[PDB]
Amino acid sequence: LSHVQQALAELAKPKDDPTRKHVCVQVAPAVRVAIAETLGLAPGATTPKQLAEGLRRLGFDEVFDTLFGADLTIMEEGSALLHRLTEHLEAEPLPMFTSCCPGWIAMLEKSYPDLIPYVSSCKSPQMMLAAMVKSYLAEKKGIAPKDMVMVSIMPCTRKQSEADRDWFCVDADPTLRQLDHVITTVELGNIFKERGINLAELPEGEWDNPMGVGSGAGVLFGTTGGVMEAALRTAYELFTGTPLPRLSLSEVRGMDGIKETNITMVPAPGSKFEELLKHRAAGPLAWDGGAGFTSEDGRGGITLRVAVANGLGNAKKLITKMQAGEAKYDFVEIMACPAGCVGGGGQPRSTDKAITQKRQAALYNLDEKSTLRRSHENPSIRELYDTYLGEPLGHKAHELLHTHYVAGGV
Ligand code: SF4
Ligand SMILES: [Cl-]
């Protein structure tokens, strides 16, 4: 039985059935914008809450926004970056690579195992949310993890292999998956139509909060610009005490699918970061000790060099020049898909050459695009850490939200 068939089997069970399980679903933003195309409509032609209603009509007991998991990734990865930056100032290496794309993680383990220490140990947004629901939420609702089923709807054909990583399980039992089944945008679209469900004709439903209390998806109003940018912002604003605006990446000449930006950071006055810049300034990626600037009275500062690679072919050319020292970066994100997740392998096929641009544009409302969201300000995220996880990068956070990598692959 395919994973789609297994999830549908769990849903086919009446809710009052003695063997019925608590079936949960989480949905990626890339899915929500592209799902309307399965009806022959434009991207974004169906609202988020219409999809929520549709999923609830399939029989899901919980409907979650993957963005909640993304806030956890931003928290952990932002802290991780700040940590590595900190220990490199006072003399887990640099540059740091992000790790949300399983296509990158796969290529990392098979072709570049010597780069493993440089990669963030953060789990993906979907896996963090999954680990959370079968731990915190299970305990809150008095449900055994074995009686909870976690489904994700993804734009990606690789998110199942990510989920199937052996140790992504509960209490060292690899049969108790943190995330059981992954369904693609087109597969979900096919399920709706085969049941006569038209999303565009549905009323607005509502999301569930992974914290098990309150209303909404447990995510505040506004946008972050994605995990990488928000992780950067997290580190930046703690380091400088000043807000980081939305990033504008510029294309690197001579390199396809590579974008970059330079971010200058002056430590906040009186901070530990100001002490470290002052009191001390004298592998496969040996890293030049950083890009720093200073001046007359000692306005000491460091320049964070960031790169983004789409996709895997273009990424190899970047790594080559990095090892050659021709490309110098501190923070690198590698996505397997040329257009990123909005153009993932699980997305509808279109004749429109600009379909990925339409998807991106329709991702959020002009209202939401104008408002900056910060993960550490999310009351649900604050509560989860204060009352359950402890500190980011800590013991509990490492066990539930972090992972490891295997040289040679799995
Ligand atoms: S870039 Fe492609 S392969 Fe990587 S996470 Fe996004 S959809 Fe999946
Ligand atoms: Cl994810």
Numbering used by the authors: 65 to 155, 161 to 351, 363 to 490
From the publication, what sentences describe this entry?
In E282A, two water molecules occupy the space of the missing carboxylic acid group (chain B, Wat717 and Wat974). The latter suggests that this local activity maximum is depending on the presence of the surface-exposed Glu residue.
In this study, site-directed mutagenesis (SDM) is used to investigate the PT pathway of two [FeFe]-hydrogenases, namely CpI and HydA1, which represent the largest (M3) and smallest (M1) type of monomeric [FeFe]-hydrogenases, respectively.
